[PDB]
């Protein structure tokens, strides 16, 4: 997925979408390519426990410091656990091995915090119709980069609150601007019709972030 994403991003960036003729960005919009999932909220407690996040469907996940994962489905009880070796187990909050008591308790804390505080990213978006989990993430001075198991890469910029949701399957990018307005574009159509320098710059940055993901797999 990452290699495909890199090729898609390289292709759009090489077309110099903001540096040519009349920009027809609107013609690159494709609402059918809207993502099914993205990260609506996140909490970095990696100093001790890990990275907690909420997906737009109100499900929650934690990527713990020991590289294990716990995912709570939006029914508020069903759980999936993923061990280091990749083994996937299914359980509930009420019915679980005693060995998972601490991790389940931690997820509860993350969940409650993200239910009580913080804004839902993409709240105004209608998602497209087995949950993806957080494969890996990292932060830079300017952004947090979240790589989902379905191939999607989300980049949230800290300073201006703008966001990209990249999907290599749709070969598309969803851009959320400073006003929380959103558009989904087909990357090949951005090559065809161009885009503003703001989106173009963020796509150049996205390529460098994908390079980091690929070189640190």
């Amino acid at each position: 997925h990452l290699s495909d994403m890199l090729q898609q991003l390289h292709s759009v960036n090489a077309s110099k979408p903001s540096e040519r003729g009349l920009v027809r960005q609107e013609e690159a919009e494709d609402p059918a390519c809207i993502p099914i999932f993205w990260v609506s909220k996140w909490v970095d407690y990696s100093d001790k426990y890990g990275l907690g996040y909420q997906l737009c469907d109100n499900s929650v996940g934690v990527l713990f410091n020991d590289s294990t994962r716990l995912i709570l489905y939006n029914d508020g009880d069903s759980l999936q656990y993923i061990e280091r070796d990749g083994t996937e187990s299914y359980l509930t909050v009420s019915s679980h091995p005693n060995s998972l008591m601490k991790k389940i308790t931690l997820l509860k804390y993350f969940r409650n915090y993200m239910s009580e505080h913080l804004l839902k990213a993409g709240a105004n978006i209608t998602p497209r119709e087995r949950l993806p989990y957080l494969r890996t993430w990292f932060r830079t001075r300017s952004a947090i980069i979240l790589h989902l198991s379905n191939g999607s890469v989300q980049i949230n910029f800290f300073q201006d609150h703008t966001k990209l949701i990249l999907c290599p399957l749709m070969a598309a990018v969803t851009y959320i601007d400073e006003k929380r307005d959103f558009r989904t574009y087909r990357l090949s159509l951005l090559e065809e019709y161009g885009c503003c320098k703001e989106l173009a710059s963020r796509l150049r940055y996205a390529r460098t972030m994908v390079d980091k993901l690929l070189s640190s797999r």
């Binding site: 990260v39 909220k41 996140w42 909490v43 970095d44 407690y45 505080h117 913080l118 804004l119 990213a121 949230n156 800290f158 609150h161």
Partner: peptide
């Protein structure tokens, strides 16, 4: 930031 908006 240690958490989202």
């Amino acid at each position: 930031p240690l958490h989202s908006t």
